[PDB]
Amino acid sequence: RFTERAQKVLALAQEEALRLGHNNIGTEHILLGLVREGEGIAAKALQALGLGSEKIQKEVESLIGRGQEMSQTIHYTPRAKKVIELSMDEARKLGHSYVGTEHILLGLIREGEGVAARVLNNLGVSLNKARQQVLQLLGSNETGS
Ligand SMILES: N=C(NCCC[C@H](N)C(=O)O)NP(=O)(O)O
Ligand SMILES: N=C(NCCC[C@H](N)C(=O)O)NP(=O)(O)O
Incomplete structure (x- = not known):
């Protein structure tokens, strides 16, 4: 149900919450996990957006x-x-049986709230436009299991 790299993101989300002394695993830790995993489609898409x-x-x-x-x-x-629930919906809507890092990223953008939204806003990210850009990247690349 999750790709191997999506599993790594969820591990790093928990890792970062512990490392930073936080008692919650929030949207901001999901975002940290997506970028620090450093290999999956989400990390490459975030990097393509200057993140x-x-x-x-x-x-x-x-x-x-x-x-x-x-x-x-x-x-x-x-x-x-x-x-994470939205990431499963995002994967389904794109014809994927496995939830990948990019679907966690799309779920995060789609939720569009919480601490991660403030981080992205501080970096001049319009969530609608980022969603469009991520989908353009996925529509330009083969990303199946
Ligand atoms: N660090 C957070 N949330 C803090 C916990 C929410 C708190 N119980 C509350 O009063 O809302 N990140 P997120 O973006 O909500 O996942
Ligand atoms: N679409 C992907 N990966 C392609 C398939 C990975 C393979 N199904 C697997 O089970 O790992 N996104 P991610 O960035 O690797 O999560």
């Missing part, structure tokens, strides 16, 4: 701050859960 790993790291830490103490427990936020 690099170090920039996103700086924005999250600036907007939220660090917990100065690695967190003890971590649970997904309601919005992050909705992003």
Whole structure:
């Protein structure tokens, strides 16, 4: 149901929430996981849009701050859960049986709210346009399992 690289993104989302001392796995950690996974279609699409790993790291830490103490427990936020649910819908609508990193990215953009939306807004990203651009990239490339 998830590609191998989508599984890596979900691991890195949790990794980053712990590393930063946060008790939630939110949309901002999903975004960090997408860019830091560094190999999947989402990382390549984010990079094509001028959204690099170090920039996103700086924005999250600036907007939220660090917990100065690695967190003890971590649970997904309601919005992050909705992003993952939307990623399954996005994969379906594109004719994919497996949810890839790009479908998590499209779900995040489609949700269009939460901390990740503020990070993207700080980098001058219009979510509608980014959605259009991601879909243009997927329509230009073979991305099947
Ligand atoms: N860090 C967050 N959310 C904080 C938790 C929401 C909080 N319980 C509340 O009062 O809303 N990121 P996201 O974009 O919501 O996933
Ligand atoms: N569309 C993809 N990957 C192509 C298929 C990956 C393969 N189904 C697999 O099971 O890993 N996106 P991602 O960036 O690799 O998630």
